[PDB]
Structure 1
């Protein structure tokens, strides 16, 4: 079942690898080499998660917990019941995410548009890899990764935050929180402006870009334009992701003491009387 304007876009070509061996659709979904890899990795990960849940002794969605090994195992492999299943699932998840990104690249190439969406997804993939790969590698044990549980991956966050006394005093955490809040505000304003322009009171004509420009110049004295707002939003989201990754990666391997004490450089400058 296609949309009324979809058929002319369903042409062949634009594949990074595979040619016409996997060039077809299954319902709405597009299949390729990376679609096959994604399906394999995702199915294996899900079935392994449910096998671990069965061996744990509970099928409750709130209570399933698959945890990394102990710190004594180091960077080596652990028994599959004592945390090796977590490593296998991590490998599968990394493969699935990379395959998803490359499938998006192939779809972009076929449609003849830009490659901004895979580039944006790469930042989230980078943040996840920093959480599960880079920081445990620098700290020296695979046991520093978070567990795969709906409610058990928040206890890890709490304990990791309280390991430095007051995590709100981390400057990179401040930057990331500010970026998050600014992104949410900008999205709300953009959606509201577009909807108000396209939906006037009953019996009134629709509006245009000039009306929106006037509104925001009357409101706050400046207008960014219909093209600059999208750039601003994309940059804000990417900056939020990048600074979240930086904040998590500087906490363990670079700083060791409490975060409030880091401000002693400001509190003890020679310029003060």
Structure 2
């Protein structure tokens, strides 16, 4: 049994790391938190410092409001009984206002008003966290990749609960907040649009989702296999290619006839993943707005 390098054999702690400074306002960075010996077997042990500016707190307030609004409703349904609350936890659901009210904000709370309220809160929570994702990068001088990639996730979300409800003229087209109920919605959606297995965007989204698990399995396993030559130091292997980068490229070239570079593999990676929610959001956006039934559409594309 040679060492496989999935868990560290020996942890090593030094002075807490307060990070690079660049242009970050350090007034907003918290203090280094504890050190997890548990986490440290797999990755970093430092639960060190989080930055919290004005966007960060806007995000955390809105996020909790959304989370609490759904929760007090769950208790109302549970009859304030803690045993029933815990029993029927996955069964509770905050449902959208019925089709009658359309795209209006005039529905009663015990009939979808709470849904609008929670959604407004989730809306500000998500876009402010996105802005946070951009600004945190600009402070450090880094490219905006993480922000662009996050936009693709926002796309699907944006379509499921906002854009497509508005093109259908009703808030009842949106997803309810609930564990079992948001699943039933998903099943119901495919059924009502003539089976999503016929949506050519759904099957593309699936290919990318599958391909993400394939790619990361490939990449992760490859960096581990060449970590005996310092493979994980990816940025330096980009600026000054070592034998880690070469052996990695060569494994794959000898296997499938082509290969990536150390930078290039991360371009493959960001795109494979990004196209999951990109293609997915287009396929949902078209469902019920332009195509009523994907079986029918598939029979005579048009």
Tell me whether the two structures share a fold, i.e. TM-score over 0.5.
yes
Correspondence 1:4 to 2:15: yes
Among residues 107, 131, 136, which one is paired with 2:165 in the alignment? Answer: 136
Among residues 235, 245, 249, which one is paired with 1:209 in the alignment? Answer: 245
Task: Write out per-residue CA displacement over residues 89-143 of structure 1, whole angstroms, 9 at most, x where no aligned residue.
Answer: 1111110111111222222122222211111111111210111011110111101
Aligned to 1:229: 265
Q: For 1:251-262, what aligned pairs fall within 5 Å after superposition?
A: 251-256=287-292, 258-262=293-297
Aligned to 1:48: 69
Q: For 1:149-164, what aligned pairs fall within 5 Å after superposition?
A: 149-164=178-193
Shift of 1:9: 2.3
Aligned to 1:76: 104
Shift of 1:164: 2.3
Cα contact 2:93–2:177 (8 A) shared by 1? yes
Give the Cα separation in 2 of the matches to 1:167 and 1:31.
Answer: 42
Aligned to 2:153: 124
Give the Cα separation in 1 of the matches to 2:18 and 2:275.
Answer: 38
Give the Cα separation in 1 of the matches to 2:193 and 2:66.
Answer: 33
TM-score (norm: length of structure 2) = 0.77
Which sections of structure 2, spanning at least 5 residues, go unmatched?
A: 1-12, 34-48, 79-83, 230-241
Give the Cα separation in 2 of the matches to 1:264 and 1:102.
Answer: 43
Alpha-carbon distance change, 222 to 126 in structure 1, aligned in 2, over 3 angstroms: same
TM-score (norm: length of structure 1) = 0.85
Shift of 1:14: 4.6
Aligned to 1:25: 30
Give the Cα separation in 2 of the matches to 1:73 and 1:192.
Answer: 53
Give the Cα separation in 1 of the matches to 2:30 and 2:16.
Answer: 16
Give the Cα separation in 1 of the matches to 2:280 and 2:225.
Answer: 34
SS at match of 2:30: strand
RMSD (Å) for aligned C-alpha atoms? 2.4
Aligned to 2:95: 67
Aligned to 2:60: 39
Give the Cα separation in 2 of the matches to 1:161 and 1:29.
Answer: 41
Aligned length: 254
Shift of 1:62: 1.8
Which sections of structure 1, spanning at least 5 residues, go unmatched?
A: 201-205, 267-273
